[PDB]
Subunit: 312 residues, 3 copies
């Protein structure tokens, strides 16, 4: 029954193997509280400021539900740039120093990488990064790792297929970052060659002793795997190489014909939203875990709000 | 003290004479709870997800106030299409399966007819239709019928003038649908000939034994009526027929000179917002019931939230 | 323990010397409630409708936090013009008469001057003006005067520099209005000649016996002053007179070199947001009171919500 060791929750590089495992146990407690028929009061009298610079329905409501299930209450904007309707302009650090006067914890989604760290360094109240523009999405990585542990029973000695746009994929890079803190983890990188995982992750996995292999055969890798983690491939990542897009039509898709060839105890994960890269008919299969994934988000974020505001 | 018989509240064709009368009694209880000076706890620990695809201030706040007066709490978006700011696209069924993880009941206003039914069929939690685009607006019909019963004392043996754009009028069609489940109901259809009520409603009233009559004399019908239910007539419904618009200038208007000729116990109803089709000076008359109409909305929706979440 | 004497909070000309001093004492109580570790229940079961016609993050959250810290709850729109997504148009008085059915107090920010008074005159529930377009911003004036009293210990016998666009400056005019209700107040008007304070304020101060002096030397006035109240000067207020803009570059700026020359017990005030007219390095100085200003906003508005809803 002590202080949470992190002052703020900003970057994947803040969490070790022990910290993670300890947070996952808290999230299992959080799930018990959510399941209960009496309203929790753990965060009674605490207010959360949801500072979003852009609408992001799913993750905003995830955090706001999380606060409410613990007894706390929310302030919300998805128009953080509009600080006053009558006097134009907005400074991140000015917004933080104004809003911390109104609230006990800020959950921020800025448009610009590096914003979450500046907020943390400016605020006298805890800050959680909900999406630092195209940079760190820490709570999404933690809820990916939690779902795996949740659905598989272990993180040590697992095989995980990361599929789709790996070059530009923010959640596959930080999932891959976090898994490498466990033992006997094998990672498959399943993508067309031109959206293939970047070297900074390849050479960090190799420094971590994580085994890693590349493929463009999804069928082949799906059969050997605990976890198929799926992301779309936007057409625009192909540029003028339509021949390569036409080569890639059909092959990086989770559909019935890929469920056919998978272990019965494997899962399909997908941070959502999805385009056509998982057909609707995969939903009926108890191995489609992407909606249970989203639900783990509520627990993980209950956990984080709880550690940051009242401690272990 | 049993389960509410409807799993979801989607379409007018779900409610019979008995169900309605039973819901109206609950809404009279709900009004007592709202009038009380202690905060109700009936829905303590329940969360409502207000999933609106477009801003709709009045009906959104109506439902959100309703939840709060019963002790419950709200999640709210009027930007449901924007599921993530970083990964584009949104699937109705995916949105429902994500958000039901965060909430206990969804109140949805989609842009497309048929959306409310799909949500109900996808969700493992009750769903209320707040506006299925240009289709069913069930809670608005129920609050129209409730106001009539509320202000008139009876639904059996009443005369109700439905006035304005009847061809394209969603609330006049479903008001008319619902009234036909009562006895000795006479309906007047008061409109220019080119926005005159469509045949599917005319031939269902005639199958229900509801007496119905058409007119373009508002003055004439107002004098024989319990209820004048008023809707605007957008100029654009006239197309190139401006001669017909100029013919219609002044005659489909509730003003002092129409109050002059009405029973003292008749009421002016109007789902709002209004353009110029009810002059401001009608507001002072105790027969203008359109604001008491809006207030009945709060009760009816308290009722629905209450039946759906904790039963009769 | 009596009724609050104001039915609504709309205009600076509603508050005398006694009323202000009494409100400031309440706001000091409100600060004690906010500092407490148990959740206040003073406004339990009261709902506030935040009716904003335009996003205005800082003042909206200020009021909403205020309601929550007292135990009350909020309804919120920053899209008040959009009354229904399906039937276009909105009438201020219709919006008020609909929304008062859902709520116990309305906090309104309209786009048009005179809107707050009409709302007050239409509503059967208290109304607070959060910003009547380019007209009265009463709670901002009250939180300016409160900060001065809060940070200086007195309002009688003080010197206050009002700096920036005084011609067009809404908060400097109403700050200046309110200060003139105290004794031995000297006001400096520090600006370029073409955005110099207007005659209606100059001749009311002179009718109040308030001493007032104009300058374009900030350095000179800063040294003699309790309070430097700073506002930006938009380039566009110069029109084609760029020569005058180039003359004004650098001289109406609060930076270290102006802190150097000020009393140790003087304060920098600025309603925010700020452009470049206060360098970031002024923030470290304990005399920069603009963030403590914003925090006083929470107290003052707690006070107002409390007087209006449950009395002294
Ligand atoms: O096909 C997809 C869908 C989502 N995402 C990632 O998942 C995140 C989901 O978190 P949020 O945007 O909903 O907060 C997005 O930010 C984005 O990085 C992908 O990489 N690919
Ligand atoms: O002059 C009017 C005003 C409103 N409505 C109807 O009333 C509904 C009010 O419900 P809401 O849009 O406020 O939810 C609208 O959707 C629309 O069908 C009309 O038919 N005519
Ligand atoms: O440089 C500035 C910043 C703000 N304001 C005033 O301060 C108010 C702050 O209140 P709000 O717009 O945040 O409610 C604005 O409305 C505006 O009148 C200025 O005059 N100058």
């Amino acid at each position: 029954p002590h202080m949470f060791e992190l002052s703020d929750v900003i970057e994947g590089k803040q969490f070790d193997r022990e910290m993670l495992s300890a947070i996952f146990d808290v999230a299992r407690e959080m799930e018990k509280i959510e399941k209960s028929s009496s309203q929790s009061e753990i965060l009674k009298g605490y207010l959360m400021a949801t500072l979003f610079y852009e609408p992001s329905t799913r993750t905003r409501l995830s955090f706001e539900s999380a606060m409410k299930r613990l007894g706390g209450e929310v302030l919300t904007t998805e128009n953080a740039r509009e600080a006053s309707s009558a006097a134009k302009g907005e400074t991140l650090e000015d917004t933080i120093r104004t809003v911390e006067g109104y609230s006990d914890i800020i959950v921020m989604r800025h448009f610009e990488s590096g914003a979450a760290r500046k907020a943390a360094a400016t605020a006298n109240i805890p800050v959680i990064n909900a999406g630092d523009g195209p940079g760190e999405h820490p709570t999404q990585a933690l809820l990916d790792v939690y779902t795996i542990q949740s659905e598989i029973g272990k993180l040590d000695g697992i095989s995980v297929a990361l599929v789709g746009d790996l070059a530009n994929g923010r959640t596959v890079r930080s999932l891959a970052y976090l898994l490498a803190k466990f033992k006997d983890v094998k990672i498959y990188f399943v993508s067309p060659e031109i959206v293939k995982m970047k070297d900074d992750i390849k050479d960090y996995l190799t420094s971590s002793g994580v085994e890693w292999e590349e493929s463009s055969d999804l069928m082949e890798v799906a059969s050997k795997c605990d976890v198929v983690y799926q992301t779309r491939i936007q057409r625009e990542r192909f540029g003028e190489r339509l021949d390569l897009y036409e080569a890639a039509r059909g092959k990086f898709i989770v559909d019935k014909d890929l469920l056919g060839v998978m272990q019965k105890k494997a899962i399909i994960m997908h941070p959502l939203p999805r385009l056509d890269e998982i057909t609707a008919d995969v939903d009926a299969d108890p191995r489609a875990a992407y909606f249970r994934q989203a639900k783990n988000g509520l627990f993980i974020r209950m956990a984080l709000l709880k550690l940051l505001l009242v401690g272990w």
